[PDB]
Coordinates of C-alpha atoms and ligand atoms in Angstrom, one line a residue:
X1 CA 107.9 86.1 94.5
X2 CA 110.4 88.9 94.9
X3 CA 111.9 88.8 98.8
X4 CA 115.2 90.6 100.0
X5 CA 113.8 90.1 103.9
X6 CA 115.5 87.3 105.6
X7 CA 118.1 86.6 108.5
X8 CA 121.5 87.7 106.9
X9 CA 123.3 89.3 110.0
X10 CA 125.4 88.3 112.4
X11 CA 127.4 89.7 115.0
X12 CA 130.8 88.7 115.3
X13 CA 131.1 90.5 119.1
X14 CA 129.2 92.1 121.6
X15 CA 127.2 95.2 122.3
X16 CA 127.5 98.0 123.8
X17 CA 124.6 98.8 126.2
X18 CA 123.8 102.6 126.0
X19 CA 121.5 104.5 127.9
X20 CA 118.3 107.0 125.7
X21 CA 118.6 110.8 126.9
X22 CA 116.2 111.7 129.5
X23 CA 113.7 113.4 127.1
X24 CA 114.0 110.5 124.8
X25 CA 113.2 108.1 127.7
X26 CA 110.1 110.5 128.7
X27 CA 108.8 110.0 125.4
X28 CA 109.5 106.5 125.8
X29 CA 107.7 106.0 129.2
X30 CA 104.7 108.1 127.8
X31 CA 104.2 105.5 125.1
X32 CA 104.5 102.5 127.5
X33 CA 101.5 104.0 130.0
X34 CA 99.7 105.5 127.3
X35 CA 96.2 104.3 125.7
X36 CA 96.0 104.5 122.0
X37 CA 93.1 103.5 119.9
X38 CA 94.8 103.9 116.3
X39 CA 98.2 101.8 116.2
X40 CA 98.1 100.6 112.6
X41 CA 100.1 104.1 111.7
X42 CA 103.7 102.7 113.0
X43 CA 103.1 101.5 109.6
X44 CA 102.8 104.4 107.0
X45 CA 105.4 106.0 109.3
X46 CA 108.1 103.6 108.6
X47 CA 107.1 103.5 105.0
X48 CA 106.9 107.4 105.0
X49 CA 110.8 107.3 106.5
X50 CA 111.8 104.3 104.1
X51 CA 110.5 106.5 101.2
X52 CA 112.7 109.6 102.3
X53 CA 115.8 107.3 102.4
X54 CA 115.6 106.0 99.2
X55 CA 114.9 109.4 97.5
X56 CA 118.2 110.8 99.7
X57 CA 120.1 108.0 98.2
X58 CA 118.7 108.5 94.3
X59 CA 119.3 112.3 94.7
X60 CA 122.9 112.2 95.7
X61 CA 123.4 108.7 93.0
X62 CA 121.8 111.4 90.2
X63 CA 123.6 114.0 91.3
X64 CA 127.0 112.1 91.1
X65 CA 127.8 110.0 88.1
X66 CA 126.6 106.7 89.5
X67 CA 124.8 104.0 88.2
X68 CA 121.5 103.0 90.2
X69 CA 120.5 100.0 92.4
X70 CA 117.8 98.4 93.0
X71 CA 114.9 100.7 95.3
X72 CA 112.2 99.1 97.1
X73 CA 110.9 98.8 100.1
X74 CA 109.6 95.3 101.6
X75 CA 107.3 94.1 104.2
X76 CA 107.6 90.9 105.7
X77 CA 104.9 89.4 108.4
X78 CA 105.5 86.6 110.6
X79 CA 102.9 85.1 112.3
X80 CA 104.6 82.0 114.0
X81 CA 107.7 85.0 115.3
X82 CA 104.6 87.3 116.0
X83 CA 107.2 89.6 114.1
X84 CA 106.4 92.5 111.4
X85 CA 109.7 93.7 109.3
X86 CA 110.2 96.6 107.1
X87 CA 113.7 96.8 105.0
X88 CA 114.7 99.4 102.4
X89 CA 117.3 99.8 99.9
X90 CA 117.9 103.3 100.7
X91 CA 120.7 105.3 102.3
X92 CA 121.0 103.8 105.5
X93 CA 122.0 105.4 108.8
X94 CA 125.6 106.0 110.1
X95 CA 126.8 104.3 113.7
X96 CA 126.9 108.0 115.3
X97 CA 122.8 108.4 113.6
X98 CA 121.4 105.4 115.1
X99 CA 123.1 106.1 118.5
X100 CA 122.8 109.9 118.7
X101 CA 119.6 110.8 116.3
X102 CA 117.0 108.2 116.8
X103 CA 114.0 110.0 118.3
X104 CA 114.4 113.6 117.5
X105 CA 114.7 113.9 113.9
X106 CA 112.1 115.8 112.1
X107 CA 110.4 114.7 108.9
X108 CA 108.5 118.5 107.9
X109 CA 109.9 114.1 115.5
X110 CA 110.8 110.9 116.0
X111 CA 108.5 109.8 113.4
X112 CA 108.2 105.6 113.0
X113 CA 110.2 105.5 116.5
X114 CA 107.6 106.6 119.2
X115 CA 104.9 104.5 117.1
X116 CA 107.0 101.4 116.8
X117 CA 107.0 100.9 120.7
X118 CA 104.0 101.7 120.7
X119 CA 103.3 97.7 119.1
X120 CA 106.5 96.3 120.0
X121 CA 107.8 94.0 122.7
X122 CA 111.7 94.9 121.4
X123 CA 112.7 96.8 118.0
X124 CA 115.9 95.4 116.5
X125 CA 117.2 97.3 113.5
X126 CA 119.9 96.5 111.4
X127 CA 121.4 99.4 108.9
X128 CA 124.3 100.4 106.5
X129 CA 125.6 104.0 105.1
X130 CA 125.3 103.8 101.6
X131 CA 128.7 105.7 101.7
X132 CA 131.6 103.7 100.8
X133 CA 133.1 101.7 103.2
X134 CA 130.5 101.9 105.6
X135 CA 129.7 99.0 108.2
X136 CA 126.5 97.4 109.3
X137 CA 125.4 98.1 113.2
X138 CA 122.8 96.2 114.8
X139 CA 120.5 98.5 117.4
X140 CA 118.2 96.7 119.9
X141 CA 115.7 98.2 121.8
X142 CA 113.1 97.0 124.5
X143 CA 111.8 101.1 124.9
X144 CA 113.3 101.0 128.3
X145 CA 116.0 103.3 129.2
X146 CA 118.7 101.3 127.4
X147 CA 119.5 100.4 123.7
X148 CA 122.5 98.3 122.7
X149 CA 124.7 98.8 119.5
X150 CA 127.1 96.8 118.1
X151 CA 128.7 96.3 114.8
X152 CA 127.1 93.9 112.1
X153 CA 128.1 91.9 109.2
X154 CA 125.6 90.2 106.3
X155 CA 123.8 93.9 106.3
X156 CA 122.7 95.5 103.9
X157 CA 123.2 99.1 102.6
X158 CA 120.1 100.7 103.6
X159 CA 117.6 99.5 107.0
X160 CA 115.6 97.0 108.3
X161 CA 113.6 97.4 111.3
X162 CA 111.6 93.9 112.7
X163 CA 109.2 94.6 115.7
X164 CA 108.6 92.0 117.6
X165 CA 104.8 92.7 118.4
X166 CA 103.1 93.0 121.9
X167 CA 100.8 90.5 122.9
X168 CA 98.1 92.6 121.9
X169 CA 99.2 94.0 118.4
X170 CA 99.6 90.8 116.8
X171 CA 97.1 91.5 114.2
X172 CA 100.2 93.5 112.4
X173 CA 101.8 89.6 112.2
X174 CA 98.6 88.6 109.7
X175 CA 99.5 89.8 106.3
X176 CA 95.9 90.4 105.1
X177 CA 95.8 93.2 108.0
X178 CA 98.9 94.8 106.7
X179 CA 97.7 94.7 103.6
X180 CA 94.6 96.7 104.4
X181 CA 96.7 99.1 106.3
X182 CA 99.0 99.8 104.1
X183 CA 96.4 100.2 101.1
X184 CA 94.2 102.8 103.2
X185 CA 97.3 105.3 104.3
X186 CA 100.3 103.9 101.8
X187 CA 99.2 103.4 98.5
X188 CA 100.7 106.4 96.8
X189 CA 104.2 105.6 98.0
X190 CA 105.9 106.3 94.9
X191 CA 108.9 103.5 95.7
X192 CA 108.3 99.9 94.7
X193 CA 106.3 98.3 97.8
X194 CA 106.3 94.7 98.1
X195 CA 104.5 92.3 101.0
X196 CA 106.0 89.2 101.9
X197 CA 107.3 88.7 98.2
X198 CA 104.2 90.4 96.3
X199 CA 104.0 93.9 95.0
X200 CA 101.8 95.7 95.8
X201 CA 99.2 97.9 93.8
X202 CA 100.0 101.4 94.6
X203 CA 99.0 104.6 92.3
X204 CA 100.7 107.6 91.2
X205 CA 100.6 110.8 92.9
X206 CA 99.9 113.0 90.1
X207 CA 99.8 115.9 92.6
X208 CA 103.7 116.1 93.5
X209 CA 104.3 116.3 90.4
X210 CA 105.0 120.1 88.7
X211 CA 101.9 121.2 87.1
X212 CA 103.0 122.0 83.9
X213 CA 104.2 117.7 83.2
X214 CA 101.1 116.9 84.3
X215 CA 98.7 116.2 81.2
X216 CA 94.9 116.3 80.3
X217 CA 94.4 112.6 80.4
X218 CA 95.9 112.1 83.6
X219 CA 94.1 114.6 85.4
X220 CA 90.7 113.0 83.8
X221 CA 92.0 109.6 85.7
X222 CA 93.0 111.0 88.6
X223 CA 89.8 113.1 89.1
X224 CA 87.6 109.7 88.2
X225 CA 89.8 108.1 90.7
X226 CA 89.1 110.5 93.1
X227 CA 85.8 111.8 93.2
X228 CA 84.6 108.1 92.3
X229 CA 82.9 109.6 88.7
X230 CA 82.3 108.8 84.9
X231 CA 82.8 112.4 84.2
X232 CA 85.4 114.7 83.0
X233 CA 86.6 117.6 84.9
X234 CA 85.3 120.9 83.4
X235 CA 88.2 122.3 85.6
X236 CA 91.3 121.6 86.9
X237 CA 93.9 123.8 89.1
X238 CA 97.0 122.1 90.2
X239 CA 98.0 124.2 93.3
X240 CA 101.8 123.7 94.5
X241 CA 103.3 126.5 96.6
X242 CA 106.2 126.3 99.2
X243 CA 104.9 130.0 101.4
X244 CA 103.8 130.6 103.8
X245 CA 102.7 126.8 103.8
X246 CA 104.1 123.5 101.7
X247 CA 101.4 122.8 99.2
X248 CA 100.8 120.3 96.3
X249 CA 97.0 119.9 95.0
X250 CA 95.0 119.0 92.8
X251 CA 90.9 120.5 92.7
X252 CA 88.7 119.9 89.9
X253 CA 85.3 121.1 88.8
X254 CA 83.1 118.1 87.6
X255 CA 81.4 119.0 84.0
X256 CA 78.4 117.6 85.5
X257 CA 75.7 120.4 87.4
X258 CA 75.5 120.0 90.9
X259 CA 73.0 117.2 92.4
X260 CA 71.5 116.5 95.7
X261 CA 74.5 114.3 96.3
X262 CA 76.7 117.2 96.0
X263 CA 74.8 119.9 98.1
X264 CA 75.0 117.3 100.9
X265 CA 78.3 115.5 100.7
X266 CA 79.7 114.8 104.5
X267 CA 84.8 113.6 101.9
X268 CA 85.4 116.3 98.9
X269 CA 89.0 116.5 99.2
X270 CA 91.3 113.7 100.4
X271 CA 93.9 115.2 103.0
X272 CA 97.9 113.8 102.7
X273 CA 101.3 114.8 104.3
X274 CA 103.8 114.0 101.7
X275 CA 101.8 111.2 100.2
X276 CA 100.5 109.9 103.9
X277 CA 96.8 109.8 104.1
X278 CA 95.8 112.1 106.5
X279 CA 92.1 112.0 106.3
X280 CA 90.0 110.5 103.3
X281 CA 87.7 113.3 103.9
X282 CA 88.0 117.0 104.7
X283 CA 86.7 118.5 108.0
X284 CA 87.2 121.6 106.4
X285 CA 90.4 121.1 104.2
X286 CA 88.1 123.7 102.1
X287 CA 85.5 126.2 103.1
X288 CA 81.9 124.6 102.8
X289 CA 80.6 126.7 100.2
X290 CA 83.5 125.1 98.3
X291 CA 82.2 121.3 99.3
X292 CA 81.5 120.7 95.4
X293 CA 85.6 121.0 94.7
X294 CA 86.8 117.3 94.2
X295 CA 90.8 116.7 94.5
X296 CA 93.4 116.3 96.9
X297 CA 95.8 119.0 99.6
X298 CA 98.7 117.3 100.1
X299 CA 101.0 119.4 102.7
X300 CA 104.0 118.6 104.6
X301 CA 103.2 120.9 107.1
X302 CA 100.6 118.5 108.9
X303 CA 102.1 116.4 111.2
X304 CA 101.4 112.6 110.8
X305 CA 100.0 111.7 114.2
X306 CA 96.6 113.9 114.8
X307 CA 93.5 113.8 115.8
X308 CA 92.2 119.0 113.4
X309 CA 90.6 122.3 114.1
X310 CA 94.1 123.4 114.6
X311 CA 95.7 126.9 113.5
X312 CA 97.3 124.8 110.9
X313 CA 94.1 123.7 109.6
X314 CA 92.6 127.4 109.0
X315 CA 95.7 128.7 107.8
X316 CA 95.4 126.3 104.8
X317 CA 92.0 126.6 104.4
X318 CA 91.9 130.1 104.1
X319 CA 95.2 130.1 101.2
X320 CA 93.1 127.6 99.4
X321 CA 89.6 129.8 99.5
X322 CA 92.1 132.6 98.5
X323 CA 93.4 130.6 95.4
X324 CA 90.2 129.2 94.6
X325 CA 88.4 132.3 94.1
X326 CA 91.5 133.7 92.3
X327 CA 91.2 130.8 90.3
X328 CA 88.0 131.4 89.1
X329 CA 88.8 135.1 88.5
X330 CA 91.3 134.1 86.1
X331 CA 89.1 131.5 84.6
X332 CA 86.3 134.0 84.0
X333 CA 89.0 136.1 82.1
X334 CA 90.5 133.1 80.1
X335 CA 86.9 131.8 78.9
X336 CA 84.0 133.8 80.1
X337 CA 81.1 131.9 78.0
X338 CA 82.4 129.0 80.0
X339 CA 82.3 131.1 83.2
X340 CA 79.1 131.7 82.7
X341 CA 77.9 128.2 82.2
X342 CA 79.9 127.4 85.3
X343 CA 78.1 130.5 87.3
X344 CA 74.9 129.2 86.4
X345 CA 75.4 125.6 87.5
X346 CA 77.4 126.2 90.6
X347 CA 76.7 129.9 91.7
X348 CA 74.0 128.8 94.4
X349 CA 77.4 127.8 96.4
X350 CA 79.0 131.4 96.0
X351 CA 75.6 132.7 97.2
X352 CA 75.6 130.0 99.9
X353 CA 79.0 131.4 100.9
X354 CA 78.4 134.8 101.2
X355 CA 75.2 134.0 103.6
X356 CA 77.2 132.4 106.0
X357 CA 80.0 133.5 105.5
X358 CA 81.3 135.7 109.3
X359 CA 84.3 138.2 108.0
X360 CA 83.1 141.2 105.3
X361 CA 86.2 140.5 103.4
X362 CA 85.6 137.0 102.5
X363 CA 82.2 137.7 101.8
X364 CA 83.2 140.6 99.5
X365 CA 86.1 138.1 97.8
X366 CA 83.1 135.5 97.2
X367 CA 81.0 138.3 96.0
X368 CA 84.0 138.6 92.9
X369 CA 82.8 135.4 91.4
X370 CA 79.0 136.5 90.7
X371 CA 77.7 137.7 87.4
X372 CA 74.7 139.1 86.8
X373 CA 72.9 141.1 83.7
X374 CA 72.9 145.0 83.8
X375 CA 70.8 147.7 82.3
X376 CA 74.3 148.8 80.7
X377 CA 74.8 145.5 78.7
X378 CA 72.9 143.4 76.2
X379 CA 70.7 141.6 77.2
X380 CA 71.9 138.1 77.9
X381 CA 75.8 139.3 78.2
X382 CA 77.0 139.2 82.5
X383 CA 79.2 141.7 84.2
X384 CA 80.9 141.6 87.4
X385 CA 80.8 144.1 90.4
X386 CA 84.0 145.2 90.2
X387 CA 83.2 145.7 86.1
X388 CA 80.0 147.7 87.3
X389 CA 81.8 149.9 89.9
X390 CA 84.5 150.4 86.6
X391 CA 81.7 152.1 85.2
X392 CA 80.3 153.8 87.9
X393 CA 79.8 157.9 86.9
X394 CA 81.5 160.5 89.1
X395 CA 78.7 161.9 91.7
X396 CA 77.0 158.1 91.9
X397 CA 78.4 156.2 94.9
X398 CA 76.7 153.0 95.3
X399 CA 75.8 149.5 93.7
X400 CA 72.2 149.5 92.2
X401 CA 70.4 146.3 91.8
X402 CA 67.3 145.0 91.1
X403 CA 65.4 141.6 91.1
X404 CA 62.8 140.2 88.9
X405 CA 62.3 137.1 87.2
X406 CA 63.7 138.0 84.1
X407 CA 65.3 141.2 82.1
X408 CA 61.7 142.3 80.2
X409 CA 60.7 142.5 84.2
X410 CA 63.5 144.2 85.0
X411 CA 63.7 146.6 82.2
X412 CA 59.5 147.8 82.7
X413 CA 59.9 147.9 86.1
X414 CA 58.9 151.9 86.8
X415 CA 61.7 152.8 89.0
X416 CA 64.3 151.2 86.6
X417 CA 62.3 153.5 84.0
X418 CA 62.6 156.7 85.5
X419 CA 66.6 155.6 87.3
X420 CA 67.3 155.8 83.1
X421 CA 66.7 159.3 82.8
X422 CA 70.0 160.1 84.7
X423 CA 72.4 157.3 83.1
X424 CA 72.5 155.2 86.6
X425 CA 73.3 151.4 85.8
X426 CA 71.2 148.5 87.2
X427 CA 72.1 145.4 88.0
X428 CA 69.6 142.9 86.8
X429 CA 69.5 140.2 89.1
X430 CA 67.2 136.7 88.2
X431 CA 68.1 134.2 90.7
X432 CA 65.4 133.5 93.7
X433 CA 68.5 133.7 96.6
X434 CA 69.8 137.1 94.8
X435 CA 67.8 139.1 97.1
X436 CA 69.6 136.9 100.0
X437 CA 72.6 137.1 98.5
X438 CA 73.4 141.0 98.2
X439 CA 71.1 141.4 101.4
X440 CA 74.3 140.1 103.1
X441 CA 77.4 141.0 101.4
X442 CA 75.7 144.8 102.4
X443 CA 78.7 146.3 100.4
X444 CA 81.4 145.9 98.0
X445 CA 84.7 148.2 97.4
X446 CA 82.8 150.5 99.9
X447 CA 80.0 151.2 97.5
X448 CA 76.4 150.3 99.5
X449 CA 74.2 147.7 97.3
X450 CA 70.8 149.6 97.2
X451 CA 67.6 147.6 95.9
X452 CA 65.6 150.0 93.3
X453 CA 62.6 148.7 94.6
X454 CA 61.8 148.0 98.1
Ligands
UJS1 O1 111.3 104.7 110.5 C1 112.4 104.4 110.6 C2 113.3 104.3 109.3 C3 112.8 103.5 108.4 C4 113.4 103.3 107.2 C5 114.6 103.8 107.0 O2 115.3 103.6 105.8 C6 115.2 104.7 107.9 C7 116.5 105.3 107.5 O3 117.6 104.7 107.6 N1 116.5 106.6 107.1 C8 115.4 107.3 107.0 C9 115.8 108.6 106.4 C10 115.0 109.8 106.1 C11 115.7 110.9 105.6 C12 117.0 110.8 105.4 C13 117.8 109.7 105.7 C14 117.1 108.6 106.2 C15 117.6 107.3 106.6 C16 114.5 104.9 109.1 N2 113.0 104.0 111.8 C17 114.2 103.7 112.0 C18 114.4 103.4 113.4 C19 115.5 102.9 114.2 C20 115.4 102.7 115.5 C21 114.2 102.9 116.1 C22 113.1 103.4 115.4 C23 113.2 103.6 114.0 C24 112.3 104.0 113.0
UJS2 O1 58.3 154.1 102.7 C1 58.5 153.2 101.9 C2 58.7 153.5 100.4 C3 57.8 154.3 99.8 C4 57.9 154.6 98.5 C5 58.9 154.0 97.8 O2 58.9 154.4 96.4 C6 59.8 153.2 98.3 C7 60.8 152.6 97.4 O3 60.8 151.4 97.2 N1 61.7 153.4 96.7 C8 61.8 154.8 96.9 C9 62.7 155.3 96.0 C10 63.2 156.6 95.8 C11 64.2 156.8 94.9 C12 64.8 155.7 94.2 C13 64.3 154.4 94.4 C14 63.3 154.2 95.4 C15 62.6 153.0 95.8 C16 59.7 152.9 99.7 N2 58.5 151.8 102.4 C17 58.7 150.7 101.7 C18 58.6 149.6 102.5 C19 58.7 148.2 102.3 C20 58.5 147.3 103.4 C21 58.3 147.9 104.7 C22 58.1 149.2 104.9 C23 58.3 150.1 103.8 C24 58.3 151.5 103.6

């Protein structure tokens, strides 16, 4: 076993009894009459803020000349003490921090502090600047109006926070609880995590990394990881982007063709906020038609304690549909034989989209990714509608189409026949829901789509 929890403080004095600001102490007083149902986060919060302190504390160590300690952070349960403890080798807090900052600092507030009392009886924390010469404090805490600081010995650089649980939260005392929790929202904390001695398994987020380090067998893990598959991904775009949102994800196309499984899925895209687990699935991290991307949207932007269907929520959706479809745009460009193959397993989504889809822009943005076979081309070969209207001959303002089962159909059908007398092109257009489809999107770079045949 590998511990650095245990009882190494003392306090040669005594405090000094200090009273919260008022708006700290209504937070405080709304979390003591309050009724929440999920209070296992206090735990991915502190391992969240433990996370941030260590990489403050590598940064500036990298930045200057200086050798590196040890970084971890350790949980500690206690059932007899009804106690849960969380210490980290990180950069520690200041005396002025702890008495002036606690409860409104922002993580992009209060974050680990509200949710602690929201378990505990009394929070007593012990930290130490990583700056030279720094001293210990001890801070104690009921959640009442009052904390008490005093200066510490035995501490060491970096935190520890033990909560002394409420009657009712002493589940968080049982290590095989703890363990769950932090495996469900924690396990891509990308410090070493131990629990009571024993490290845990956590996995690497491949995500936050930039895209360019990131290499073909690691996305083929991570994408069997995530969507739970034997397949490779035919696809893969690693998204990161700081504006107008933070953003760092992964989607991937499976090489398998859609099933029934897929058409239906509830859970596409796991959801995180700086490697917190937001949500294992995604109300609508993505549009539906794009349900059969598997992957994960990591953004800081989303605050840790929700319940979605905010602004924030359709902002990011709609960058991602934007990406996504420029995605595929480029895709078509890079390799459009595998396009195609791509098109004809996964295009009943596009259509799909375009149905229901409420604003004429996004409809006409979906509408970039279909292909379909012209009178203008050989047979077999696709085009797109921008790639028709290209082509379109001055005096000839709209999108001609025309359905039929297949191109020897298409090409004897007697009003394609007599249209080639004057040069018009013809889309060709094979799929049953294609009549659906451009029923819908109505028009396309202001041309009107006209069927040749009524
Ligand atoms: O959740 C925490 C917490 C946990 C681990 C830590 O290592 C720190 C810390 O010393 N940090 C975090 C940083 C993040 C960024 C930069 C520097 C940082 C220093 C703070 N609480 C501490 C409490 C103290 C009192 C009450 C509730 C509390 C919750
Ligand atoms: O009155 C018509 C009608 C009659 C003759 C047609 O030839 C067409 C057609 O399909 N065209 C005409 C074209 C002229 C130039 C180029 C292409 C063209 C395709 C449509 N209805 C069709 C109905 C279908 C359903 C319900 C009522 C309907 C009435």
């Amino acid at each position: 076993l590998h511990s650095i929890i245990s009882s190494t403080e003392s306090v040669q004095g005594s405090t000094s009894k200090h009273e919260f600001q008022a708006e700290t102490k209504k937070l405080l007083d709304i979390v003591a009459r309050s009724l929440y149902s999920e209070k296992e986060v206090f735990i991915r919060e502190l391992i969240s803020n433990a996370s941030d302190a260590l990489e403050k504390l590598r940064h500036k160590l990298v930045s200057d000349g200086q050798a590196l300690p040890e970084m971890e952070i350790h949980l500690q349960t206690n059932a007899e003490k009804g106690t849960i403890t969380i210490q980290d080798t990180g950069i520690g807090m200041t005396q002025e921090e702890l008495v002036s900052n606690l409860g409104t600092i922002a993580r992009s507030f209060g974050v680990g502090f509200y949710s602690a009392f929201m378990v505990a009886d009394r929070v007593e924390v012990y930290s130490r600047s990583a700056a030279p010469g720094s001293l210990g404090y001890q801070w104690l805490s009921d959640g009442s109006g009052v904390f008490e600081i005093a200066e510490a010995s035995g501490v060491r650089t970096g935190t520890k926070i033990i909560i002394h649980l409420k009657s009712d939260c002493k589940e968080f005392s049982s290590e095989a609880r703890v363990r769950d929790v932090v495996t469900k929202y924690s396990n891509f904390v990308s410090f070493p995590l131990y629990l009571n001695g024993r490290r845990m398994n956590t996995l690497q987020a491949i995500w936050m990394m930039d895209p360019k380090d990131v290499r073909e067998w690691q996305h083929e893990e991570f994408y069997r990881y995530v969507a739970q598959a034997h397949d490779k991904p035919r696809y893969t775009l690693h998204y990161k982007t700081d504006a107008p949102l933070n953003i760092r994800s992964i989607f991937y196309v499976p090489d398998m063709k859609p099933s029934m499984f897929d058409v239906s899925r509830e859970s596409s895209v796991a959801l995180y906020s700086r490697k917190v687990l937001i949500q294992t699935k995604a109300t609508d991290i993505l549009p539906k038609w794009l349900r059969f991307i598997r992957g994960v949207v990591d953004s800081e932007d989303i605050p840790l304690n929700l319940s979605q269907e905010s602004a924030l929520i359709r902002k990011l959706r709609d960058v991602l549909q934007q990406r996504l479809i420029k995605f595929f745009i480029d895709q078509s460009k890079k390799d459009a034989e595998k396009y195609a193959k791509f098109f004809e397993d996964y295009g009943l989504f596009m259509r799909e989209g375009i149905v229901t889809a409420t604003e004429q822009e996004v409809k006409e943005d979906i509408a970039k990714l279909l292909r379909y076979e012209s009178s203008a081309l050989p047979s077999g070969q696709l085009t797109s509608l921008s790639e028709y209207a290209s082509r379109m001959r001055a005096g000839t303002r709209n999108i001609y189409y025309l359905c039929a089962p297949n191109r020897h159909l298409a090409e004897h059908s007697p009003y394609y026949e007599a249209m080639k007398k004057k040069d018009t092109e013809v889309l060709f257009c094979f799929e049953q829901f294609d009549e659906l489809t451009l029923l819908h999107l109505r028009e396309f770079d202001k041309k009107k789509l006209i069927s040749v045949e009524t």
